[PDB]
Write a protein that binds this ligand. Structure first.
Ligand SMILES: CC(=O)N[C@@H]1[C@@H](O)[C@H](O[C@@H]2O[C@H](CO)[C@@H](O[C@@H]3O[C@H](CO)[C@@H](O)[C@H](O)[C@H]3NC(C)=O)[C@H](O)[C@H]2NC(C)=O)[C@@H](CO)O[C@H]1O
Length: 185
């Protein structure tokens, strides 16, 4: 149903780096920070809950992972202008990069969420093949990290996030996702 690629609750995470936390206005970093940020985005996220859940269910991926990606990428739309990110390259709640993929659908609809989730799954699969001695949950983590920096950037479990934005991509997303999971996603 939603567990084909792993369980976010089983992933170890160090959460948000200070590089992510601070700019968000917090004085502390880590797991708790990730969760506070996620909490600040819950109300806006809730506008898309049904759709997020629908896509998760359809593609067999945890909706909480989608929500965590959305929170990190666009704060659930809050920081977008007609769906575009600040540099004009990313489009939608999930910020599909126009330079690498032609964006499909409206910025906050099911088509877009599907496209973004598809890209994530493809990265999960790449990682599965690349590191077949890892546990599924570990592969999920790797996949999320690749979403940001590409699969080539994942060369190990321990340092996968070095090189992603703020050097904490997946660790942050996973922590955000753990919060969502607790809120019915
Ligand atoms: C400057 C900033 O950090 N910009 C970010 C974007 O890079 C990022 O989008 C993702 O970028 C990576 C690296 O371009 C894309 O990887 C490519 O993915 C395809 C498979 O989808 C693979 O064929 C390519 O070889 C691979 N390229 C490389 C260099 O490895 C990836 O597709 C992008 N993900 C999305 C969803 O478009 C966005 C999103 O996290 O964040 C910006 O910060």
């Amino acid at each position: 149903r939603t567990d084909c690629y792993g369980n976010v609750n089983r992933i170890d995470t160090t959460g948000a780096s200070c590089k992510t936390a601070k700019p968000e206005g917090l004085s502390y970093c880590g797991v708790s920070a990730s969760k506070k940020i996620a909490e600040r985005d819950l109300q806006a996220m809730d506008r898309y809950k049904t759709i997020i859940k629908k896509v998760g269910e359809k593609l067999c991926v945890e909706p909480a992972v989608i929500a965590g990606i959305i929170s990190r990428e666009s704060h659930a739309g809050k920081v977008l202008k007609n769906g575009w990110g600040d540099r004009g390259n990313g489009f939608g709640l999930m910020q599909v990069d126009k330079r690498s993929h032609k964006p499909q659908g409206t910025w906050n609809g099911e088509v877009h969420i599907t496209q973004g989730t598809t890209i994530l799954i493809n990265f999960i699969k790449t990682i599965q093949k690349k590191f077949p001695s890892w546990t599924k949950d570990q592969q999920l983590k790797g996949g999320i990290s690749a979403y940001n920096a590409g699969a080539g950037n994942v060369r190990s479990y321990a340092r996968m996030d070095i090189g992603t934005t703020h050097d904490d991509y997946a660790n942050d997303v996973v922590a955000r996702a753990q919060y969502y999971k607790q809120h019915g996603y």
